[PDB]
Amino acid sequence: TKRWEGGYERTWEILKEDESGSLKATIEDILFKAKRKRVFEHHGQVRLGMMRHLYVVVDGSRTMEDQDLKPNRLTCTLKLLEYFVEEYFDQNPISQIGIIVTKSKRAEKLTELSGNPRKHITSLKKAVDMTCHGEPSLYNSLSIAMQTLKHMPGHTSREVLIIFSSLTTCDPSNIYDLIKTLKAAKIRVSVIGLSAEVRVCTVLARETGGTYHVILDESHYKELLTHHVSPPPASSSSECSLIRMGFPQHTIASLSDQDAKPSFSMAHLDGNTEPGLTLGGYFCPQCRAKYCELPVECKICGLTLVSAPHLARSYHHLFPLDAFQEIPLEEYNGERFCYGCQGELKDQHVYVCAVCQNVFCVDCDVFVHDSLHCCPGCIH
């Protein structure tokens, strides 16, 4: 049989009248039910993460000159890569990104593996005017990625992302041995092709544990990149994994005090133009090196400089707020004012925290569970 071949649904039977005007109670109930449409979780997915050293491999062959994506594959790929880098650094505080470009059967490490977002974006913008020639070489790119990631600590999740536009790759040696070596190195490899499915890419993704996808259009490309943004799940406890990192306070300098000390920035010193000799900035807690951007690993002492709010923004996942107990207004024998907004309690249901036993209205409960992530009563 079929679900639609039975009886016609009569949804209007829900409403009923008993006092010639009780429809107001029904519409009030409908309005109350309309709220609380969320699961009280902004993400609802992975509640933790792990440090990722992600390498992005970009094809630079003649196939990038194709105009499947306006204006050409290279420009759209670089723009979406800039967006991906921005989002990935936004959602990963202590992750690192390296960029490799394959061209003319060779691989060039365009950018070093680091956590600076501006440097990667600058390199990508510079690479827009490159020359597309030759054929890609997956073997060389994977060899470079493995050599760079061979010495990385085990607790970090080593991931390699390949954007393969051309359907042909030139390998100076056997590639399956390299795939076995990568599998022994526990390196995750994911490939996002553009033209069609390639057997070698699928085999590599399956053996290394990654995912292989093929782009349908620019929207699908962006969706795949956004899916790759999310960090992989992490084990409960792996090893003694830690890292010595500093928290440089943003100490500016004012000429009113006698300690107005100008200093050239370490990052700006390598530029062709005159480095910005600003009044102040971020001073390294270890060697007093001055930096303008964060998070940037210190050039002098090798210390990692991170911003504390960025790390703290994900702390609510570690200690999620328990759902409040829903109690009807009639059954609660106490104050009729919300503890959070001081508003009068007129809703049919009142929510009470299990810890401090305070009273919160529907709006305040939703605000606490969605944005505040902390019970105001428990703070006191």
Partner: protein, 154 residues
């Protein structure tokens, strides 16, 4: 396909005349017939036009720009060994076969059984990785029915 010619080619009395077409969640095959080329000239393998330069150039261009869209192996069939060798010689004479070579590897099937076997083996091993390859053969050859081009092959 013709169920009316087999009963009369050999003395036969069929009572079935039954055909079946496979169906899947998606169309697994995309047959298409290519007529005139980019020059609006027919690419028919006519006997009077076997030595024609235009048709050979169109065939080479089709095999070139086709080799860059379908990866990991393309199986091409020609009318005869003589026509196949005359076509590949003309392609080698022009600066066109190198463009196909730099995309996919070219393997030619010959009458030698051992040579054909080793050519098939190297074609398979080249299609295993991302190099890709082209297998040129003849319709009326022992390699046409001796092997099956399973998925990811051809």
């Amino acid at each position: 396909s013709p169920l009316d010619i087999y009963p009369k080619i050999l003395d036969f009395h069929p009572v079935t005349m039954a055909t079946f077409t496979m169906t899947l969640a998606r169309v697994c095959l995309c047959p298409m017939i290519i007529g005139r080329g980019n020059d609006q000239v027919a690419i028919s393998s006519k006997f009077e036009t076997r030595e024609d330069i235009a048709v050979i150039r169109n065939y080479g261009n089709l095999l070139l720009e086709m080799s860059a869209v379908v990866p990991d192996g393309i199986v091409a069939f020609f009318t005869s060994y003589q026509y196949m060798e005359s076509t590949v010689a003309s392609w080698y004479e022009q600066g066109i076969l190198e463009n196909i070579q730099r995309n996919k590897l070219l393997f030619i099937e010959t009458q030698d059984g051992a040579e054909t076997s080793v050519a098939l083996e190297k074609y398979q091993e080249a299609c295993e990785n991302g190099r890709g390859a082209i297998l040129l053969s003849v319709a009326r050859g022992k390699v046409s029915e001796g092997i099956d081009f399973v998925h990811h092959y051809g």
